[PDB]
Amino acid sequence: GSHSMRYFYTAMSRPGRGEPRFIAVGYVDDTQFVRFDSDAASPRTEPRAPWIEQEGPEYWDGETRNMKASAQTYRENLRIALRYYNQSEAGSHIIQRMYGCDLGPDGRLLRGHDQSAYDGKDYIALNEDLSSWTAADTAAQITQRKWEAARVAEQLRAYLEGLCVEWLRRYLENGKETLQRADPPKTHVTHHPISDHEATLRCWALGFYPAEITLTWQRDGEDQTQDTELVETRPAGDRTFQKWAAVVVPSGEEQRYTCHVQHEGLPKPLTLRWEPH
């Protein structure tokens, strides 16, 4: 339907164990297509999806050049963060950044993102207007002033407006056969007794793409939100995802429950019940 591209950077310090480590991944929708690891024997921006491999020498040199610079830049940001927070050089800390572009179904730029975090909490984010920043604490304000002073926001907006949208349209074309096809889930309901009096019903969704899905348990048409146990949508390893929801029900009540599945691949949501044979 609507498509997006995101980049994820992670920087970790390892005091006394080696240099800080930098890892970058790129995705289009839920499909990872590139990787960089500063710890690789010979660090390189490598393909992780087949359709990206067509990209030329200028491209691959360009991104390896870029990612190695970024790793240096975040090694220094990690040091700077120590000043702002007055933290010791013995601790291990983590900086993260996620940024990308959303394209509306229409295909023009619909939204742009940039968010950064320190030790897993919000640090600074590019606002929706792509011109201003939101600082999480007084330390991030120090960065905020430097960045409006250096007009970074104008530079990242130039990226998301243009180069991000342009490559992501190019990728969507190259990866047409996988990126632009929705795989509906395969669904079935499972039963396991806990005891003679109670059993667990579990609703399964398998082999779907994209990852976005909703699973719901209802009893006599009313939501068992509070009593449903949900697991995080998980990768199958073949680029499709899985999920399940389960409830513990009194024996003999199994057919009052119905499992409802919503997925972009589905024409109409599915309603499932336990069917033993």
Binding site: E63, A69, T73, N77, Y99, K146, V152, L156, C164
Partner: peptide, 9 residues
């Protein structure tokens, strides 16, 4: 394609 940084915190 990724974004060139090169801003420092």
């Amino acid at each position: 394609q990724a974004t060139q940084e090169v801003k420092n915190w």
